[PDB]
Structure formats: C-alpha cells, structure tokens
Design a protein around this ligand. Structure first.
Ligand code: HEM
Ligand SMILES: *[C@@H]1O[C@H](CO)[C@@H](O[C@@H]2O[C@H](CO)[C@@H](O)[C@H](O)[C@H]2NC(C)=O)[C@H](O)[C@H]1NC(C)=O
Ligand SMILES: *[C@H]1O[C@H](CO)[C@@H](O)[C@H](O)[C@@H]1O
Ligand SMILES: [Ca+2]
Ligand SMILES: [Ca+2]
Length: 357
C-alpha cells in the first residue's frame, strides 16, 4: 500500500504507524537512547509480562495496553514504581493517534525507542492487538530482590520463556538506569554505556563489587564495580537479580555467552522480544508491520572492554565450560564518570507530560 505521505508499505493498516513514529521521535525521544526512551522500553516489558498461564486470563492480558487503559491500577503497584512517567508520556499519543490501540502503541513505542540505541536490533512489530482489556493483578512483575528460581518461574508462567530467553531480554539492562532502588540518587546506570545497546552490562556485572553509587542498604541492590559518581553523573548500580543470574548454574554460561558477542546478543534479544510483544495474543492473528519500525542506529563494531579501574583480575566467573574472552582495558588508573547525558554533558532534561498515572 501507499500511505498518505507517499511511503510504500506492506499493508495499509501499517500506515498510521508512520506519523506515530515521527511524533514519538520529535516529542519524547529526539532520536536518542535517553531517559524517555529508557522509560518506554521498561514499560513495554511491564505491560507485556503481566499475564499468567496458571492463574488464567483474569490475572492479566499480557501486551494489552492495560498500563495505559487503567493508569491508576498497575502503575501504583510497588513493583511498578517509576512506570507512571512512561504511561503519562504515552497516553497523549493514544488519544491523538486514535486509530492505534493502546497495546500496539506500547509495543511500537518500545521498538522506536530501542532503534535509537546503537547496536539494537530492529524489532519485529506485529499490529492488531485489541483496544479493550482488564487491569492486571499485582505480583506478576519480577523484582530485583527475587531469587533466580522465582524469576525463571515467573517468566515460564507468563509465556513459556526459557532461561536463555530470560537472560536475552536482560540485554535491555545495557540501556537502563534506576531511579527508585535507592532514593538518594537518580539515574544510576546498570552499565557504563547506558545509551549504547552493547554487551557491557554482561561484562560489568561479572566484576567484583567495590562500593555503592548511593547508600549500601537498598532492597534489590548489591555492590557495584563502578560506584563513583559526581554531580548528576551517578555511579553504576548493580541489581541483585542481575548478579544472581550471572552466577546461578542455570544461567551463568548464558550470561557469560553474551560478553563481547554483540550480534549474538542483539539477535537473541530480538527473538525473545518477538515472543514478549505478543503475550496475550495469537501471533497468527496479528498483521506484520515490521517495515515501519525505524532502522536502528548501527554499533561502531568495537569489542567490549574493561572500563578503567577494572581488569581481568576483578572477574568473578561462574561458567566452567566456556572460555572468557580476551578483552582490552581502557587506559587510566581510576574510574571515569558515566555521563548523565547522551552527548556527554549532565544537562538533558526529558520531555514529561502530566497525566493520570
Ligand atoms: C528479572 C527481570 C528484571 C528485573 C527484576 C528488572 C528490574 C529493574 C529495575 C529494578 C529497574 C530500575 C527501575 C528504577 O528504580 O527506576 C529496571 C530498569 C530497566 N529495565 Fe529492568 N528488569 C528486568 C527485566 C527487564 C526486561 C526484560 C526489560 C525489557 C526488555 C527491562 C528493561 C529495563 C529498562 C529499559 C530499564 C531502565 C528504565 C530507566 O532507565 O528509566 N528490564 N529494571
Ligand atoms: C482506545 O481506548 C482509549 C481509551 O478509551 C481511547 O481513548 C480516547 O480517545 C479519544 C479520541 O479517540 C479521546 O477523546 C479520549 O479522551 C480518550 N480516552 C481516554 C480515557 O484517554 C482510544 O481512542 C481508543 N483507540 C482506539 C484505536 O480505539
Ligand atoms: C575516564 O576518567 C578516568 C578518570 O576519572 C580516567 O582514568 C579514564 O582514562 C577516562 O579518561
Ligand atoms: Ca498489560
Ligand atoms: Ca550499554
């Protein structure tokens, strides 16, 4: 089909997603893998994973836009702390781009945001999820204090995900920060390149922790290898769950297997997101609108490297059957600050709309 702007696409129903991507980029992402991008990518996961095979449909409808349609329910569960900003940022698009369901809006916005992170894959994007659902029940969202057994069970109950798929989805912690885990600091990144969809998080979680970016007693947190921060350049945070996954026998070799394996990580993440994005639906009932997902920013192609102040002697390895790769170390004797902003500064405020969440 030919869309009103002249774009030739796969199916006419995909046309509306073109001005929606443009509006999302101009209004809240500005083609950056920044704060607003980060928040929407986390929303795609919290929207989608609130579903349970064992409890039945009444517990949640999966990737169904329930966070936007019932903005006062799920966003207020304690495990969803901080999700309110992303919901309030997307509700104005749901109202304006009113031929696209809330559910499709959430998934597509996540795809658009990810395309702004260098190295990310171009997600599949299927369309057609209905615009009506129910609010999910509490307890469906994994939490960073949870054990690996609990986490793996939640993902298996939610949609059959294997441990490989679970760690695959956690490549999203390559472009991720924490505002709520420690209330004294904001925007504590999970790797040293939170604007770049690279394998650094897999490497860095395997380094011995030496301190905390804020306080030392937060639930769900463990010591960080790069805790130094200054001004708004908050030090690296480590989640207990990421640490646990990197060392548990079920997932340790999978975790290590992504270190310095960019294309493998990105392809694996795309495969797992293809499953996540259609939870609560039959994929044979959704139309393929992948050609309207923006093409992602390419990686530079550089190998993973130890950040300065760290090196191979700091590794805490847990996979007996796979050799840890030979990596170089960035020069310098002390840690570099992790930039608060994509262009290197500390001043880059994200557009935020007020809203009901
Ligand atoms: C065991 C699984 C997971 C747990 C327990 C976990 C936990 C967390 C925590 C606690 C935060 C910090 C929020 C805050 O305090 O501000 C967060 C951030 C984030 N998570 Fe996860 N998550 C996991 C899986 C996922 C998955 C599968 C994705 C998406 C595919 C995702 C993407 C992100 C993103 C993008 C952020 C950054 C949000 C921002 O910077 O504002 N996470 N995660
Ligand atoms: C999906 O459901 C939402 C919520 O009912 C609809 O949102 C309304 O959209 C109109 C414009 O069509 C606005 O005037 C309302 O203010 C919106 N409601 C709320 C509570 O925000 C949306 O239109 C529906 N989209 C589709 C594709 O049916
Ligand atoms: C980042 O900053 C540290 C100093 O804090 C250096 O050691 C490193 O080489 C990089 O310039
Ligand atoms: Ca949902
Ligand atoms: Ca990164």
């Amino acid at each position: 089909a030919v869309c009103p702007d002249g774009t030739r696409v796969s199916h006419a129903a995909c046309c509306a997603f073109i001005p929606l991507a443009q509006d999302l980029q101009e209004t809240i992402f500005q083609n950056e893998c920044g704060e607003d991008a980060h928040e929407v990518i986390r929303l795609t996961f919290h929207d989608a994973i609130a579903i349970s095979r064992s409890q039945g449909p009444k517990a949640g409808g999966g990737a169904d836009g329930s966070m936007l349609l019932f903005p006062t329910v799920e966003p207020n569960f304690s495990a969803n702390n901080g999700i309110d900003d992303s919901v309030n940022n997307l509700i104005p698009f749901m109202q304006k781009h009113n031929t696209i369901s809330a559910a499709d809006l959430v998934q597509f916005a996540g795809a658009v945001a990810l395309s702004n992170c260098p190295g990310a894959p171009r997600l599949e994007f299927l369309a057609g999820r209905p615009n009506k659902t129910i609010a999910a029940v509490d307890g469906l969202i994994p939490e960073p204090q949870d054990s690996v057994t609990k986490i793996l069970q939640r993902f298996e109950d939610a949609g059959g995900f294997t441990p490989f798929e679970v760690v695959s989805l956690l490549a999203s912690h390559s472009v991720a920060r924490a505002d709520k885990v420690d209330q004294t600091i904001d925007a504590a990144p999970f790797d040293s390149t939170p604007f770049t969809f690279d394998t650094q998080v897999f490497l860095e979680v395997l380094l011995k922790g030496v301190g905390f970016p804020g306080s030392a007693n937060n639930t769900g947190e463990v010591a960080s290898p790069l805790p130094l921060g200054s001004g708004s350049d908050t030090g690296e945070m480590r989640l207990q769950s990421d640490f646990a996954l990197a060392h548990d026998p079920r997932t340790a070799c999978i975790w290590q297997g992504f270190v310095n394996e960019q294309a493998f990580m990105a392809a694996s993440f795309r495969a797992a997101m293809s499953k996540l994005a259609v939870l609560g639906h039959n994929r044979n009932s959704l139309i393929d609108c992948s050609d309207v997902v923006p093409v992602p920013k390419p990686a530079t192609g550089q190998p993973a490297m130890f950040p300065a102040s760290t090196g191979p002697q700091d590794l805490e390895l847990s996979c007996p059957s796979e050799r840890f790769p030979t990596l170089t170390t960035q020069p310098g004797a002390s840690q570099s600050l992790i930039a608060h902003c994509p262009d290197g500064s500390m001043s880059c405020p994200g557009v935020q709309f007020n809203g009901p969440a």
